[PDB]
Amino acid sequence: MHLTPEEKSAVTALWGKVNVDEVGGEALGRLLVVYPYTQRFFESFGDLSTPDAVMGNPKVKAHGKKVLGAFSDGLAHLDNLKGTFATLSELHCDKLHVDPENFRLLGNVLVCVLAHHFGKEFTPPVQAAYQKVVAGVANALAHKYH
Amino acid sequence: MHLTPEEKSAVTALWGKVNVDEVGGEALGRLLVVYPYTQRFFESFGDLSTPDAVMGNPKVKAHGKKVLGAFSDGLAHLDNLKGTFATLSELHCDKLHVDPENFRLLGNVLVCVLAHHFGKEFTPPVQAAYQKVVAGVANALAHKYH
Amino acid sequence: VLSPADKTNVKAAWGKVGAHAGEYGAEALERMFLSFPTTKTYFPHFDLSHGSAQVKGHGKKVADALTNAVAHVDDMPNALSALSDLHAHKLRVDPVNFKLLSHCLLVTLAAHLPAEFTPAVHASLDKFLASVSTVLTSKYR
Amino acid sequence: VLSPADKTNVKAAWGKVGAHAGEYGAEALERMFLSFPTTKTYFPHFDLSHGSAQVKGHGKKVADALTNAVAHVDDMPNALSALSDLHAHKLRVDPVNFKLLSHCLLVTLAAHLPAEFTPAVHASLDKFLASVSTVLTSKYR
């Protein structure tokens, strides 16, 4: 991707320390809490009436694991995000009807989760590389919309 | 920025009826009027305190001409907007310090001015095609920012 | 924040729209769907083809709310309350879309009111639509 | 709309920032300049190098304005009158930039308040920064 080699390594190096299980669920639960309008896509997940109901909803957590596993996969192909996500792009447009603005919201929430999770290790330059990656993933996922 | 053969035709045909001069001064003046904060870059133009003041300013008219002149040349190279605007992109960033967000605002105001001017011939499909072009151009001009 | 001048401008332009409101409404929706395809993600249950009755019908509802909003320009919050409820609790449209529709309404107005769409009125209308938008997403969170 | 719960959350969170406020504001700025390079177009007169004296200075000023805003959560328009003016009539920073800085402020806070940065507090802070932003650009036009 349009990341310097230094940035590419920084991303990878940190990602290795991420518990995709844990982080996916926190990232999708916080999206649902901070931006409640996003709940619109998950009526079938059950109760999302409160912060606590959202954070502890197992469908939330399981879907988060799924989202983040797909996210993790694109990290192995920073060079062909478009290619890694074409299928998922079509699915999200044609089958799910998700406005792609949501991909951007999720990207910023994830940045916040990584910062919370890593503290001081999530330095300005590391965040900057991560900002480039989340933007890259939202564009790749928005790519097949029509 | 993908224009179907028909979009390209539509763009081209309308543009051959545009008086750059006239349209340029109108688009730049409207910008200055609707989004007054954009006046931050043109203090030397004089008094831009009233719509009448803005619209009749000759500095605003001349500038609008310059800007739309360049715009017009890009229409000649829709295949390589990036390369065509590379130098202007570096100029806007390093010398002018213009937040690329202004290119998006100017593009939208421009669409408003062509609709105003052409009326009914400025159909939904023609607008869609111009929307692709102004975004392409704004993106080409923001490309070299760092 | 709408000045008296703005309110004056809006009442005036919307006045000339008059009876054509609903037509402009549907025109604006069409321009939106074509120009900004992502907005179609909110109408999967709609026939989005040219002249769809669904779009014509929807566009009339949208023009009617706007007419209602011009009539109560001094108290949009209360005048639009049920609509802000619906948007916040049911529809849940991401706020960037409001800016897309507002742009397409100005395009419509420009293309139909050459004499009336002066810079000053354009400026007023832009601000008015931004305010309606703020009202409509005021209860999001 | 800040509810009583939001206000408690913000005061709590910000109480915790305490004396590090200027250090967090400088860090937030540095984070903004690196992640969103177009925001540097407003600071052509600044040395944006890491640890620069202008950044540190500016950072404290932003931090202090926030502190004040928290102290006057119920009266923001009045508390930030001077800043609203300054931004609206002099600085004239496009409103999107406010969204970028708010994000970088939240990231800084998250990186420093492991215990306090819960989803509920995170939501409260996000809502608070959007309110501050709204006041600061409320006199733009």
Ligand code: HEM
């Ligand atoms: C990093 C961004 C995202 C990635 C990589 C991602 C990935 C995925 C994947 C892999 C699936 C399941 C695919 C399958 O059925 O085989 C999925 C389903 C889904 N996603 Fe996305 N997603 C992302 C963002 C979002 C966001 C922000 C939303 C809405 C806020 C969303 C809404 C959904 C929904 C509603 C489903 C279907 C769940 C079900 O199967 O019932 N996605 N996503």
Ligand code: HEM
């Ligand atoms: C379609 C997008 C635009 C194009 C193609 C464009 C093109 C130009 C050109 C050709 C010049 C002259 C540069 C030279 O001396 O070689 C220029 C200068 C300038 N532009 Fe841009 N421009 C665009 C948008 C804008 C916008 C939206 C702003 C601010 C809102 C802006 C601010 C300026 C300023 C302040 C100058 C210098 C004026 C002077 O020195 O007289 N430009 N632009």
Ligand code: HEM
């Ligand atoms: C100026 C801004 C807007 C106004 C005045 C407005 C007004 C309305 C009105 C009056 C209704 C119907 C209420 C009813 O029949 O009970 C409605 C419904 C709806 N609106 Fe909004 N709206 C606005 C913006 C938007 C935007 C930007 C979108 C998304 C792109 C949107 C999406 C919808 C949808 C999906 C419905 C439901 C349509 C149906 O299923 O029949 N609206 N709106």
Ligand code: HEM
């Ligand atoms: C959280 C929202 C913001 C707050 C609370 C804030 C606060 C301040 C304060 C307290 C000052 C100094 C006033 C003085 O000189 O006495 C200032 C100046 C300034 N602000 Fe804002 N600001 C905010 C957002 C922004 C954004 C997003 C930008 C641009 C990206 C920006 C650009 C500037 C600039 C360029 C100055 C003048 C700096 C100088 O030359 O010293 N501000 N701001």
